[PDB]
Design a protein around this ligand. Structure first.
Ligand SMILES: OC[C@H]1O[C@H](S[C@H]2[C@H](O)[C@@H](O)[C@@H](O[C@H]3[C@H](O)[C@@H](O)[C@@H](S[C@H]4[C@H](O)[C@@H](O)[C@@H](O[C@H]5[C@H](O)[C@@H](O)[C@@H](S)O[C@@H]5CO)O[C@@H]4CO)O[C@@H]3CO)O[C@@H]2CO)[C@H](O)[C@@H](O)[C@@H]1O
Ligand code: CA
Ligand code: CA
Length: 684
């Protein structure tokens, strides 16, 4: 199978995701619509159900709406059963139309469809070459009040119909009872309730098992990707452990939502994208794009700066999911925002690095500020808008041109309003020119690119006032970039030498199968390198010119670079691949009497790669927490660690460059074969 095929569940770099609120798209089956005060046929009260379902999505796939648009993947609302109760917030009636108020993760939402309808969605989608990504929110259940069991459904959780427990009289401790978060710190937002939503205690063995079992169900049904909700509100450790169980079963592209207000670098966000095992929604990319094209609060330099900065911060920048807007912010289009600006933002996103996602209705210039106005019903299915055209012409390029899907990014020409960047992967090139100025054209001179000698036509065909250019060994002849113009020029050819464009997933234990996408691998099975270790023969389950499926070797756990050798020639190295010791379990390390100095933090390290292999650098675990579950001088932290292994570890204090280790002998602990555990020790 090509890296391009719909069967590639491990990489979305060549795809274009279409995010849609199932309820607000198309009601293909009115028979499953809710009744009473929870429904609104006219869909004017955006807090109620409008009727949209999976049958509606099926209908639009069959009548080629998505195929003509060019999108190759659908990101739908959480498919699990949500609460049925209606909630009254200060006079206004609220429903679980969004799918975020789950009550049973092992059953479907009857309003969206039956288990059979879902299977029908998967089948119909894969037939037309479209992948299905689902929303999954393992952080909480639904709104709840501990003192009032009559409010909503008391955040009750069900296991395929069987009641597990509710928020009140939670003797088993399935949920956190530490009040609501004030968002003052990372720790505060992880162990306290997100508003009134009942927060799960993933340290509980039953809850841990439940989510591993629950996700396997949906994976087994054929889902191609997972968008994890509120990753910033659950321990990285548990999530990493959960992630490894998924990758050991049926690996699929997984990304999470870690909200960011600006394009500025955030330490915790970067660590998560680099250490969790999943990528993230690129909010930094989003901010820059909006500041420049929408709000006019930044110029083209802020755009180039963001490109360079994110490529530096994230180990795998191509795995970050880009977008111009979504359900968490105001629609890109506003009366003060021109159609051309939205169109340019799209063109930019579609030709830039990462995995592009389009919020439903963007092609129809849908407006709407804040929740719930930004989740209005699809106004029409017109295929004649300029935005629709841009997407249908640029989206396919992610499949046909590897420069756009796997390439690096380099600035070629720039000023306050003009931006010319180049995507390059091997001998394939793509050059995009953008002039955000709506009234003045720009005279471009001295433009140098990697385009071979020849005449290039605008891939957009001039719909965005693009023009044709002429190359003479890279040097482009002088031309005028029209007002509000944006053009795309490309060049593609076959690769003779091996070039790795993507590896998915980037974390796993020996025995797992990983996918390597690229160009020039040849038909004859060669050899795959994980550092120095060579993998050949049966270990390589599949080998083609554009994709290689290989089994992770039994080597020491650690960070490795991946390389491919075909016909004696070595390819480029794909860095930062994490090999685990084996199966993972989440363990809470608790240390008592660890009093510190001002600005001094407590960290943890031990004899396994998951603990940093006695390192005190960035691979060490920490800084530890000391406010919610346990209070200072007691510290704690949830860590994904190998199952059934005898571990040795020690805590250490670190302020500046001074390290203070625990005295005495190392602490020891044998981890459980599965689930979770808590190990408490005293600072030596
Ligand atoms: O304080 C009392 C409070 O009562 C209600 S608030 C009430 C609201 O009216 C309802 O609409 C409903 O909101 C839910 C949304 O409709 C639903 O889509 C999700 S939103 C989801 C986000 O998508 C996700 O980003 C994350 O939250 C993000 C924020 O979006 C982001 O801006 C920043 S601040 O980071 C956050 C975390 O990273 O998680 C949420 C939750 O899944 O759920 C919400 C919550 O249910 O329900 C709320 C209360 O439950 C009154 O309206 C208020 O006036 C009043 O103050
Ligand atoms: Ca319906
Ligand atoms: Ca939480």
């Amino acid at each position: 199978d090509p890296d391009t095929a719909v069967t590639n569940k491990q990489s979305f770099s060549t795809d274009v995701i279409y995010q849609v609120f199932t309820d607000r798209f198309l009601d293909g089956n009115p028979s499953n619509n809710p009744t009473g005060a929870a429904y609104d046929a006219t869909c004017s009260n955006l807090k109620l159900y409008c009727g949209g379902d999976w049958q509606g999505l099926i209908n639009k796939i069959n009548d080629n709406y998505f195929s003509d648009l060019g999108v190759t993947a659908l990101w739908i609302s959480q498919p699990v059963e949500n609460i049925f109760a209606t909630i009254n917030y200060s006079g206004v009636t609220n429903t679980a139309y969004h799918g975020y108020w789950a009550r049973d993760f092992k059953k479907t939402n009857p309003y969206f469809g039956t288990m059979a309808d879902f299977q029908n969605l998967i089948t119909t989608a894969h037939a037309k070459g479209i992948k299905i990504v689902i929303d999954f929110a393992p952080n909480h259940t639904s709104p709840a009040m501990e003192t009032d069991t009559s409010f909503a459904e008391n955040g009750r959780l069900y296991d395929n119909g069987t009641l597990v427990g509710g928020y009140t009289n939670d003797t088993n401790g399935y949920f956190h009872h530490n009040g609501g978060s004030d968002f003052s710190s990372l720790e505060n937002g992880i162990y306290k309730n997100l508003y009134d939503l009942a927060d799960f205690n993933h340290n509980n063995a039953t809850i841990d098992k439940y989510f591993k079992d629950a996700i396997k169900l949906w994976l087994d049904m054929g889902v191609d990707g997972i968008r994890v909700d509120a990753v910033k509100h659950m321990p990285l450790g548990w999530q990493k452990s959960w992630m490894s169980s998924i990758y050991a079963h049926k690996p699929v592209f997984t990304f999470g939502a870690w909200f960011l207000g600006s394009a500025a670098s955030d330490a915790d966000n970067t660590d998560f994208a680099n250490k969790s095992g999943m990528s993230l929604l690129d909010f930094r990319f989003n901010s820059a794009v909006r500041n420049v094209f929408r709000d006019n609060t930044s110029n083209m330099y802020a755009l180039d700066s963001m490109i360079n900065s994110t490529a530096t911060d994230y180990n795998q920048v191509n795995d970050q999911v880009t977008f111009i807007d979504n359900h968490d912010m105001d629609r890109f289009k506003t009366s003060a925002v021109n159609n051309r600006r939205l169109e340019q933002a799209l063109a930019f996103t579609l030709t830039s690095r990462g995995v592009p996602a389009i919020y439903y209705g963007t092609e129809q210039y849908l407006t709407g500020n804040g929740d719930p106005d930004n989740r209005a019903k699809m106004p029409s299915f017109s295929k004649s808008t300029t935005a629709f055209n841009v997407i249908s012409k640029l989206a396919p390029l992610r499949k046909s041109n590897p420069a756009i899907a796997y390439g690096s990014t380099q600035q070629r020409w720039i000023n306050n309003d003009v931006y010319v960047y180049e995507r390059k992967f091997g001998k394939s090139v793509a050059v995009v020119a953008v002039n955000r100025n709506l009234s003045t054209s720009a005279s471009i001179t001295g433009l140098s690119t990697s385009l071979p000698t020849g005449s290039y036509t605008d891939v957009l065909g001039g719909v965005l006032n693009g023009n044709n250019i002429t190359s003479t060994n890279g040097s482009i002849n002088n031309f005028t970039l029209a007002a509000g113009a944006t053009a795309v020029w490309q060049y593609t050819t076959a690769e003779t030498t091996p070039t790795i464009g993507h590896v998915g997933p980037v974390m796993g234990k020996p025995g797992n199968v990983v996918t390597i996408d690229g160009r020039g691998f040849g038909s004859t099975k060669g050899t795959v390198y994980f550092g120095t270790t060579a993998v050949t023969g049966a270990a390589i389950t599949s080998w083609e010119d554009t994709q290689i499926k290989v089994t992770i070797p039994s080597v020491a756990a650690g960070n490795y670079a991946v390389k491919v050798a075909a016909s004696g020639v070595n390819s480029n190295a794909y860095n930062n691949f994490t090999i685990l010791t084996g199966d993972q379990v989440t363990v809470r390390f608790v240390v008592n009497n660890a009093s510190t100095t001002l600005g001094q933090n407590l960290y943890l390290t031990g004899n396994v790669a998951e603990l940093g292999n006695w390192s005190t650098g960035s691979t060490a675990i920490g800084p530890a927490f000391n406010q919610v579950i346990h209070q200072y001088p007691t510290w704690y932290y949830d860590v994904s660690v190998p199952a059934g292994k005898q571990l040795e570890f020690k805590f250490f204090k670190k302020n500046g460059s001074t390290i203070t280790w625990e005295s005495g002998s190392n602490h020891t602990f044998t981890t459980p074969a599965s689930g979770t555990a808590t190990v408490t020790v005293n600072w030596q």
